[PDB]
Design a protein around this ligand. Sequence first.
Ligand SMILES: *[C@@H]1O[C@H](CO)[C@@H](O[C@@H]2O[C@H](CO)[C@@H](O[C@@H]3O[C@H](CO)[C@@H](O)[C@H](O)[C@@H]3O)[C@H](O)[C@H]2NC(C)=O)[C@H](O)[C@H]1NC(C)=O
Ligand SMILES: *[C@@H]1O[C@H](CO)[C@@H](O[C@@H]2O[C@H](CO)[C@@H](O[C@@H]3O[C@H](CO)[C@@H](O)[C@H](O)[C@@H]3O)[C@H](O)[C@H]2NC(C)=O)[C@H](O)[C@H]1NC(C)=O
Ligand SMILES: *[C@@H]1O[C@H](CO)[C@@H](O[C@@H]2O[C@H](CO)[C@@H](O[C@@H]3O[C@H](CO)[C@@H](O)[C@H](O)[C@@H]3O)[C@H](O)[C@H]2NC(C)=O)[C@H](O)[C@H]1NC(C)=O
Ligand SMILES: *[C@@H]1O[C@H](CO)[C@@H](O)[C@H](O)[C@H]1NC(C)=O
Ligand SMILES: *[C@@H]1O[C@H](CO)[C@@H](O)[C@H](O)[C@H]1NC(C)=O
Ligand SMILES: *[C@@H]1O[C@H](CO)[C@@H](O)[C@H](O)[C@H]1NC(C)=O
Ligand SMILES: *[C@@H]1O[C@H](CO)[C@@H](O)[C@H](O)[C@H]1NC(C)=O
Ligand SMILES: *[C@@H]1O[C@H](CO)[C@@H](O)[C@H](O)[C@H]1NC(C)=O
Ligand SMILES: *[C@@H]1O[C@H](CO)[C@@H](O)[C@H](O)[C@H]1NC(C)=O
Lengths: 318, 318, 318, 169, 169, 169
Amino acid sequence: DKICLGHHAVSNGTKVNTLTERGVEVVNATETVERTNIPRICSKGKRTVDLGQCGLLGTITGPPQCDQFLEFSADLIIERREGSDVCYPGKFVNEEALRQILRESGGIDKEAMGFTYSGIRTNGATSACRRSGSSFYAEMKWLLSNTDNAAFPQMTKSYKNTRKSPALIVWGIHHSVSTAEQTKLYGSGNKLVTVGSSNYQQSFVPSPGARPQVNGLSGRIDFHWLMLNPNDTVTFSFNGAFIAPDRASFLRGKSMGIQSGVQVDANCEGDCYHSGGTIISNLPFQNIDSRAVGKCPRYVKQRSLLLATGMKNVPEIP
Amino acid sequence: DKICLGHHAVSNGTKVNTLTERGVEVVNATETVERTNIPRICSKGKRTVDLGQCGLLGTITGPPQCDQFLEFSADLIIERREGSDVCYPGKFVNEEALRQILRESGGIDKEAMGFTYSGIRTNGATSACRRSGSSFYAEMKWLLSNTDNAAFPQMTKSYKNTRKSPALIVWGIHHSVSTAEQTKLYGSGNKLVTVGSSNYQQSFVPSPGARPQVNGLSGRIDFHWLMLNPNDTVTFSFNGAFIAPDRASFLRGKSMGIQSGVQVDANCEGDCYHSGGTIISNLPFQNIDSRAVGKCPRYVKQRSLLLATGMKNVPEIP
Amino acid sequence: DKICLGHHAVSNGTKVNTLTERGVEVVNATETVERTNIPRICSKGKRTVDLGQCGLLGTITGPPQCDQFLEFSADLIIERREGSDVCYPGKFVNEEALRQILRESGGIDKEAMGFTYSGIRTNGATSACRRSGSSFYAEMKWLLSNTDNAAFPQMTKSYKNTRKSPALIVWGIHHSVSTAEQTKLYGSGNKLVTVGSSNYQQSFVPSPGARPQVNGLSGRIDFHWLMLNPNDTVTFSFNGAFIAPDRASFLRGKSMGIQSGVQVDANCEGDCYHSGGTIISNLPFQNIDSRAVGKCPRYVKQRSLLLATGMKNVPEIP
Amino acid sequence: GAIAGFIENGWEGLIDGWYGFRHQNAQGEGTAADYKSTQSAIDQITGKLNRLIEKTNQQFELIDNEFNEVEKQIGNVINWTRDSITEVWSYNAELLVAMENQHTIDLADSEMDKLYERVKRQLRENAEEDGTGCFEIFHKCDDDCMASIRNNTYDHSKYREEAMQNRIQ
Amino acid sequence: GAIAGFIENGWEGLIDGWYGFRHQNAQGEGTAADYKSTQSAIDQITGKLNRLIEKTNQQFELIDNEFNEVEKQIGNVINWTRDSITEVWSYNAELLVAMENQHTIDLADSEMDKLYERVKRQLRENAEEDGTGCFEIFHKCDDDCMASIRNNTYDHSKYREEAMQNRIQ
Amino acid sequence: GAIAGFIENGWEGLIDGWYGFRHQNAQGEGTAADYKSTQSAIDQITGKLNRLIEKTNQQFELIDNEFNEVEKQIGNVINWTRDSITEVWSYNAELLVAMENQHTIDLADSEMDKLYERVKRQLRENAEEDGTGCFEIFHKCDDDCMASIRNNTYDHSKYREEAMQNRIQ
Ligand SMILES: *[C@@H]1O[C@H](CO)[C@@H](O[C@@H]2O[C@H](CO)[C@@H](O[C@@H]3O[C@H](CO)[C@@H](O)[C@H](O)[C@@H]3O)[C@H](O)[C@H]2NC(C)=O)[C@H](O)[C@H]1NC(C)=O
Ligand SMILES: *[C@@H]1O[C@H](CO)[C@@H](O[C@@H]2O[C@H](CO)[C@@H](O[C@@H]3O[C@H](CO)[C@@H](O)[C@H](O)[C@@H]3O)[C@H](O)[C@H]2NC(C)=O)[C@H](O)[C@H]1NC(C)=O
Ligand SMILES: *[C@@H]1O[C@H](CO)[C@@H](O[C@@H]2O[C@H](CO)[C@@H](O[C@@H]3O[C@H](CO)[C@@H](O)[C@H](O)[C@@H]3O)[C@H](O)[C@H]2NC(C)=O)[C@H](O)[C@H]1NC(C)=O
Ligand SMILES: *[C@@H]1O[C@H](CO)[C@@H](O)[C@H](O)[C@H]1NC(C)=O
Ligand SMILES: *[C@@H]1O[C@H](CO)[C@@H](O)[C@H](O)[C@H]1NC(C)=O
Ligand SMILES: *[C@@H]1O[C@H](CO)[C@@H](O)[C@H](O)[C@H]1NC(C)=O
Ligand SMILES: *[C@@H]1O[C@H](CO)[C@@H](O)[C@H](O)[C@H]1NC(C)=O
Ligand SMILES: *[C@@H]1O[C@H](CO)[C@@H](O)[C@H](O)[C@H]1NC(C)=O
Ligand SMILES: *[C@@H]1O[C@H](CO)[C@@H](O)[C@H](O)[C@H]1NC(C)=O
């Protein structure tokens, strides 16, 4: 009579690594590094905007592409590569900082700044901003002299933020193709735009000159922005080449912004995103995208790291 | 007859975590994460300055608030929220880099730069810099024309650093409320200030324009700084709207700067600080402030991590 | 009769550390932290350039020092402290970003931009750029009026990148010692240089003024650069004080740049460098240089961390 | 036609447990699994699993842009920081798994010993070790007796006379 | 009114040591602590403590400002770096403590075994294991004899005849 | 002129192996090394070594300049990041080595036990432990018999009668 103590084993052994051995067989193991991707944006439970052709910064100035998003609201914001912040050729100064701000704004609430003008045209328009016919940015006013070559009077407009949150203020400087064109629009002489706050002070001059044609146009409108503290005021002194704002922006709350090139899905529920889709996993690590955002597992170089979930596999002596 | 081997146990067991179990009772444990804060700045053994109303950058230009600190010396430097670098409204360019420099300067040693002027007023003063009566920055000279609307002659002042350490040079550009005011002070025409070194080259223009009233004033003085290498020279060519320095600054040695809103204590001895006080601990980790500075334990998310200092607690069978 | 089981031991024991003990003797141990340095640059298998007196940025503009490197090619690029990007006193804007770009360029391929000029001198030269006699940057053209004090006509030159790779474009602004000198060179009046692309827009003004003499000269030429996208065009509108490029640069491929003050060796083969030499090691850690580059072991504070390669050493009872 | 326990081999036929008993008596050969040691091991492994499932509440947002590249200097600083951090987590992950697996394997062996040691202590002086993980029982152990061992109800006092007799001569 | 050692229970009455002896003879019941094994365990635990007390000489200074916020871009890069680093140290701390505690517990069990094994080897063939951490001594062991075991001066040769006699029959 | 095994002492004379046998019979004293346990331990240690030799393919380039210092703000951010990372790797290295060494030492002890346990199981009832890592063999074991133990060919059945006779009286 005889009694033996033993432990189970398989022929279906899977190799793992330890401190000492490399490829020691265990009975059972599981993966710790996610590689399984969902090529969609799982948006269930989250208010989502697919800006598409509307560049995120375009939601503030308002080219035609962004007309639907002028006062949008979201929990998740999706930028698209075909997006554009611009109709009339140009770019923001400190663009990326502004994007990072708007990506977690929860959307924007617009408010009239209430500027009034005299002895001046405000109907500045272009073929590039076609909305039915020639037009311009929806939240801005392209200011001209009055007739042609006429003198542009010095002006000084101010706006106070009477709200409990900081106000996104945006203005533009226009750079004509030539001094001949700058003169035709705003009259002769050097042009200066000054912008004053209570924690901000800058100065701006147009730079007329030949440039490559973008959208058929060699002129550039470069945008500038600041955040106006509550109860503080901004003041705009200028005498031409100035793109005045009509409204200010206020951040709605909290959101998250991503860039992607895949479709959205309102049935799937996720919280970790990259440009190629959504990562849903309880695994501690992932090997999909180093730049993945949201609440994600840590990114690693390795594609696989097997965790032993069973004892060492020792074959039976036949 | 019978002899048994055993180990001690308690009813006063404390739970800890391991690789496998969560909440396994051990006989004895200790905390590894500090949460105990001392709401004071333990300054014993360290020469300490509580700048109070004097902004750190104000120690260089010298508004009234910083008159006691014009040549201060310290091992520990404390900034206060009510601090201000300014009497006449304005701000430094590259302010934070400069703060970071002065926080470990060990204090400053000032030295006359020896500038002399002719056909010009140097008694520029303001109501904002009240020291008894109207005055100005202590280390600077506000230069004017001579009478009113009068022409400001072109000038060119230079200064060599004859010392073995780099010299902190600071100058200011004045931005008048109007071109009318700029003319009244420095005469008509465009104004240029050039600053030349042997590893630095910049240029500056005033930007006269309406701005909100700070301290009743709509004018701005924005400051600029550079570090002059030993035996190198700076040169100031200008024709108005220039805030000239009277003295240069030299760093005394080594120190540490903090921002805080709690009192100082000269009896307690510490080496790790945050805005809310001092952390004195031999524990490897802390959960008080992520931005804590000095020589500190590592910051962690968790408030508690118990380290077992005793065996597993196994209750006696009654 | 008696049989005993035992393990070996030595009198030559070496102390290591564990979780519990500090200085526990083991039979045998090995070092895990490299401290052994090779005070040479092991360049075997790698095409190597020792720029010497030629600053890396100088390879683009082409002072005399860099004439051998105007179209260099390398796998490894070595900067030297005596290096200089300049003959006529000045500096690049965004210099470090440009260096970082060129360090992994694999070298540069130059191409004529094909600019032609009329009613203007292009033979701008200086004593500082002596190449036989007075000369100038090899890839640039110093443009003047024509006689002296003469008017400099407005010009507008453009260049398209007809290649599949981005083009490094470099131009210069000249800052005369005086407006008197600026007038003598380019005529009277304010001078403007505009630079336009399809993702870039800037503007430039000369800042004439007295500066310290570098190489006997008080004038400064500060350089500016951009990357021109394939099939995109740059346009230069100007009326004086402009340092025009003659050729554009194209990146050859991939390389690595280091700064060092030690000789090169073509026999030794390495892949981890610092300014003091090469680190060749299979050890996981190193305590030589925190800024070491290439493929290196991790830098640590400790000079030594012994890994036990033998059992605990227990002396024999004598 | 002999049987052998742990020490050079596992049992591929043991399919209802991790650890178990295998015996042979007059009634033949039999194999049963031990619950307590099996569950203990399973509890410890799943314990590790739950620990590695503990998600983070740290949210991270975009710091650069893959449509419109940020400035070179700050862009290279970012890539340098992320790559450095990635190197750190890759190391941690590699070490964590390697360390865990070494422990999972060892605690599995540990449970085997404890079971063997328990049975040895049940049998007292009525059995001897064969050196293959088995015990040579020096008395008659029918299927009921074998079951008494498996459920820790084996009273060695009952068999002690018969056993020591057979052991001594 | 029996006594039992380790293996399902500790002793709450053992208050002058970590490991100890408990006996019963004609003179009654007694409990004493073992010094050597207790101190060894204490030396190892405090050893870990001193190791975790080893402070750093790395000084860190302010990189941002909580009165006057720095620029957004560089400010977000900083927060992103600090949060990433914080995630790393939080992980390290969690793992360090978990790993240490697992080892502290195991080395404590280890010391218990070593003590039990030592006593077993002292008694030779004069005792048998009861399976509760105790030894059944097959001879008269007065308080002096019990003390001889605790201080490793028990000469089994002295009791070997009387013991084997009582064990065999 | 006695001999002793592990448990308070190693053998400085054992120079051809890590673990070994030392005996004394009528033919005198002898010492031989055991191959299997020695190689197993060596395989595990070198296993760690190769693991720590696994180089990285992560390339890093210059992010600052030691000839011409970068701007203060971005320069301090860089130094702050590198120092923070350095603190992390220094910690990892310290912990890795400490953790490895603790394990290297323990697995070495483990191998010693396994060897001792194997020999104990070979000898069956023909020997007793002396408590110094040695076995008192209760029969004549010439050099050939000692060799039979070292190569696991010792048949205890051959010596069982003579042994139990000498053990009992
Ligand atoms: C080999 O190892 C894997 C990994 O542990 C084992 O698979 C695991 O099996 C358990 C139970 O079947 C799964 O638990 C499940 O949890 C989810 C979530 O609570 C629940 O919805 C399920 O109903 C189930 O209770 C566990 O998820 C699963 N792990 C994986 C990665 O699939 C497997 O059992 C092991 N092999 C053997 C033969 O035991
Ligand atoms: C439960 O665990 C804690 C943590 O180890 C034990 O408390 C510790 O007790 C020792 C000795 O009483 C303390 O050592 C001390 O060191 C300081 C600094 O050198 C010295 O000034 C003291 O005179 C003393 O020697 C140690 O600091 C203390 N740890 C803590 C966190 O208070 C405690 O003893 C354990 N419980 C039991 C019942 O042992
Ligand atoms: C004490 O520990 C050290 C570290 O393990 C031992 O030195 C090591 O010895 C081995 C074999 O002699 C060396 O392996 C070698 O590998 C290289 C590369 O493949 C090969 O070219 C050699 O021919 C040899 O096979 C190993 O490099 C070496 N390690 C070091 C750091 O030198 C040493 O043996 C130990 N002491 C004793 C007494 O065993
Ligand atoms: C609001 O602004 C006014 C001036 O416009 C100022 O006097 C006042 O202090 C500010 N704050 C409040 C709370 O009124
Ligand atoms: C000091 O400055 C002079 C010119 O001002 C220069 O010639 C000299 O090289 C510098 N250095 C020393 C050590 O004199
Ligand atoms: C090249 O440039 C021309 C204008 O110069 C433009 O029309 C065209 O789209 C560009 N790309 C290609 C592929 O021709
Ligand atoms: C950052 O890394 C990505 C990944 O390859 C690269 O494409 C990008 O160019 C890097 N950023 C910069 C500024 O080079
Ligand atoms: C950095 O983090 C702090 C902590 O909440 C936050 O208040 C601050 O706004 C962050 N910095 C920036 C630039 O957003
Ligand atoms: C970065 O660290 C090095 C190392 O000491 C130091 O020399 C340098 O000054 C630091 N950078 C800055 C901008 O201070």
